[PDB]
Amino acid sequence: HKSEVAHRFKDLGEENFKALVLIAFAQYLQQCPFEDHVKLVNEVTEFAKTCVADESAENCDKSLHTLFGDKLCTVATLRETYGEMADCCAKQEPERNECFLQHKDDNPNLPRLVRPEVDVMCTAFHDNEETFLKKYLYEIARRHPYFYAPELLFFAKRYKAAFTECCQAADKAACLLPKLDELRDEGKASSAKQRLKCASLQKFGERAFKAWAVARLSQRFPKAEFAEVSKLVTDLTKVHTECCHGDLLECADDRADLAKYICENQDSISSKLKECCEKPLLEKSHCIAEVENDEMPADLPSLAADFVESKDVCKNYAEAKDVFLGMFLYEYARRHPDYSVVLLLRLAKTYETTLEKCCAAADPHECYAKVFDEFKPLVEEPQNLIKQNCELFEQLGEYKFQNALLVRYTKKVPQVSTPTLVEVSRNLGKVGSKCCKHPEAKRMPCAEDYLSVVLNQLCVLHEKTPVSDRVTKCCTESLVNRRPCFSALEVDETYVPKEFNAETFTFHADICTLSEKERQIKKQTALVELVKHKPKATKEQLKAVMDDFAAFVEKCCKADDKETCFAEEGKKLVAASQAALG
Ligand SMILES: Cc1cn([C@H]2C[C@H](N=[N+]=[N-])[C@@H](CO)O2)c(=O)[nH]c1=O
Ligand SMILES: CCCCCCCCCCCCCC(=O)O
Ligand SMILES: CCCCCCCCCCCCCC(=O)O
Ligand SMILES: CCCCCCCCCCCCCC(=O)O
Ligand SMILES: CCCCCCCCCCCCCC(=O)O
Ligand SMILES: CCCCCCCCCCCCCC(=O)O
Ligand SMILES: CCCCCCCCCCCCCC(=O)O
Ligand SMILES: O=C(O)c1ccccc1O
Ligand SMILES: O=C(O)c1ccccc1O
């Protein structure tokens, strides 16, 4: 196009254009104030319309990266606020832009964003809506500089609905809060998920990623031919590779381009794309990536014709090991949407191992006639972890269930930070909440998604603050080994029980007047220091105590005179349990 800006403005819309320019500049100039940024958006939007009016207007033919950089090099305090980043302005565009990508801060030092009161929030949102969103949109961006922009916009649009609906309600907070937490968590997960995909692209390699996508894709579009999926795995790989490079616009077009190919090849890909394809440039990619799996053929043979029996298995496999193995994954995944992607790589890594062995045999066929046999236990184990856990969760409530997990893990690795356990057990604990709601069909996949972040997130904390060679192994190991590795952890025997401290176990009436969360976070934080002091406790010697506490509260919060009750009663509880747990 004669004018990069004229185009992006025209098919995004003025509204979407400004939100996107804001986030863009908010991720770079993270230290400037809101008024300052609003400055740019308006300076830029005014310039843009210039270009829409005349594609040949002054400076409209300049590239975005160029225009973007110029504006970046426009800030007066650039050199004294961003220091090095300012040295980027002394470079020619191709490098400049590249220098600006490197001089960005992943984790800045801004304070945590504090959720105001539903009243002041709803008020503010009402008074000056636009600013209310753009500002906090500004606030999210500057804290998550790498978070893909458009997606951040989708959360914005959502957050906006959260208010539109709830602020005009009766028991507002009862409507908004259990939406903000959902939107928060949800965005914290989206942030961790794209941060990992890239972490995966470097440590593990191009091949490994490709393996991943052939599976998730044929699992998604199971009616595509192998060649059609390969095309996509290839186009997709480019995408993540560039997007993981940082450049937003480069990343954006790769995504746009690909979605164009997919929409002009629906008949060749899925039938579930009518909708998504019918949307405007902004939604397509997003929409598609979220579309449901198409239904499979139904007649579909059995993977035994081409991978076990049939002559020339080794002949085919040896000609192009990967294309072959890819064809295994393809054929295997498409007949199993119910499978966790990583479980499919496990099966395939097996089959692989097998051929490298059996195709170097006297009578091959005989050597691997027993291969699909080795798949049942690999499949079973993860399936049976779900049963057991969801069964357990149908039994106890989410909370009562998050405490089983708490004790479970506190005994697995007592060394880990107490606050880290509560959090893990909680986040981990939720997972069963919104996965065990799905029937078998969607479960296992479900878990792999959430469990993947909850685990990486856990590794990172352990990365920065190592604490157990064991979680380092599980965290250092391969993706296919990660999750199972963790389920392998056994109760720690070498552990030496944390010596006692009544302060850690002493409770004041303030608990009576605490927000449920706080109350739970508080019961659980102790339940842990409890397992950490008296680890050799039976869920028997342990289900107790927890009960003498259940009413220990009812006995001091209902009381006319708390304060002291939480002292005289307290001494009695601690004492009763000092002995109970010999
Ligand atoms: C997994 C995932 C990726 N993405 C984006 C972010 C990634 N770039 N970065 N950073 C990009 C990789 O193709 O897709 C997304 O918007 N939502 C998601 O759930
Ligand atoms: C891109 C997101 C735009 C969302 C705008 C946020 C307005 C909501 C107020 C903050 C709510 C969550 C803050 C928090 O949970 O700490
Ligand atoms: C300084 C000017 C900045 C302009 C930024 C324009 C960003 C346009 C993003 C379009 C993203 C489409 C994403 C998609 O289709 O998945
Ligand atoms: C587009 C080419 C398709 C290639 C498919 C390659 C599949 C081979 C990977 C086998 C699984 C073990 C490799 C890994 O560690 O992820
Ligand atoms: C273990 C100290 C950190 C706590 C988490 C360790 C185990 C997390 C693995 C979760 C995977 C399976 C879920 C489960 O089996 O309960
Ligand atoms: C709150 C209870 C949550 C329990 C969820 C456990 C689900 C286990 C998922 C196992 C995934 C295995 C992945 C793999 O083997 O590659
Ligand atoms: C040394 C003995 C200390 C006694 C402290 C017990 C710890 C109690 C944790 C309570 C968990 C209960 C959850 C609930 O009450 O619903
Ligand atoms: O912190 C949030 O509330 C949030 C929301 C959406 C996306 C990323 C986020 O951090
Ligand atoms: O971004 C896409 O275009 C996409 C397409 C298919 C599957 C996952 C995806 O993220």
Of 380, 411, 427, which closes a domain? 380
Determine, yes or no, domain membership for 141.
yes
Alpha carbons within 13 angstroms on the beta-carbon side of residue 228 total: 17
Radius of gyration of the chain (CA): 28
CA 326 to chain centroid: 26
Same domain, 460 and 386: yes
- Virtual CA dihedral for 559, 563, 567, 573, nearest 10 degrees? 40
The Cα–Cα gap between 7 and 24 comes to 17
508 marked as part of a ligand binding site: no
253 marked as part of a ligand binding site: yes
Determine, yes or no, domain membership for 561.
yes
Alpha carbons within 13 angstroms on the beta-carbon side of residue 425 total: 28
Give the residue, by CA position, lying nearest to ligand 1 atom 8.
243
Same domain, 554 and 481: no
Same domain, 111 and 186: yes
310-317 own/partner pairs: CB under 8 Å, 24+ apart:
311/365, 313/355, 313/359, 313/364, 313/365, 313/368, 314/355, 314/358, 314/359, 314/364, 317/355, 317/359
Identify the burial level of 138 via C-beta atoms within 10 angstroms of its C-beta, where 0-12 means exposed, 13-18 middle and 19 or more buried: buried
Same domain, 343 and 325: yes
Q: Residue written as tokens 């997130």?
A: 457
37 marked as part of a ligand binding site: no
- Sign of the C-alpha dihedral, residues 221, 226, 228, 231? positive
CA 133 to chain centroid: 23
Whether 435 is in the pocket of ligand 7, judged by its Cβ within 6 Å, is no
Q: Which domain holds residue 132?
A: 106-195
Whether 189 is in the pocket of ligand 1, judged by its Cβ within 6 Å, is no
Same domain, 132 and 62: no
How many domains, the chain?
A: 6
Determine, yes or no, domain membership for 52.
yes
Of 459, 475, 492, which closes a domain? 492
Same domain, 363 and 397: no
Could you please report the per-residue DSSP string of 536-564? S--HHHHHHHHHHHHHHHHHHHSSSSTTT
Solved using: X-ray
Same domain, 559 and 460: no
Distance (angstroms) between ligand 5 centre and the Cα of 229 equals 34
The Cα–Cα gap between 541 and 580 comes to 7
Determine, yes or no, domain membership for 225.
yes
Same domain, 266 and 211: yes
Same domain, 277 and 326: no
Same domain, 258 and 269: yes
**Closest residue by Cα to residue 100 from 46, 48, 4, 24:** 24
Determine, yes or no, domain membership for 579.
no
Same domain, 13 and 93: yes
Determine, yes or no, domain membership for 29.
yes
Give the residue, by CA position, lying nearest to ligand 3 atom 11.
252
Write the CATH number for 47: 1.10.246.10
Distance (angstroms) between ligand 1 centre and the Cα of 173 equals 31
**Closest residue by Cα to residue 142 from 181, 104, 189:** 104
Q: How many angstroms separate the Cα of 51 from the Cα of each of 9, 39, 57?
A: 9, 19, 6
Q: Residue written as tokens 């097998």?
A: 354
Determine, yes or no, domain membership for 578.
no
Q: Which residues contact 83 (CB under 8 A, 6 or more apart)?
A: none
Of 195, 228, 243, which closes a domain? 195
**Closest residue by Cα to residue 166 from 153, 157, 179:** 179
Same domain, 363 and 275: no
Q: Which residues contact 11 (CB under 8 A, 6 or more apart)?
A: 280, 281
Give the residue, by CA position, lying nearest to ligand 7 atom 3.
574
Determine, yes or no, domain membership for 581.
no
Amino acid found at 204: F
**Closest residue by Cα to residue 507 from 447, 552, 559:** 552
4 marked as part of a ligand binding site: yes
Whether 346 is in the pocket of ligand 4, judged by its Cβ within 6 Å, is no
The Cα–Cα gap between 533 and 545 comes to 13
Give the residue, by CA position, lying nearest to ligand 9 atom 7.
289
The Cα–Cα gap between 379 and 278 comes to 38
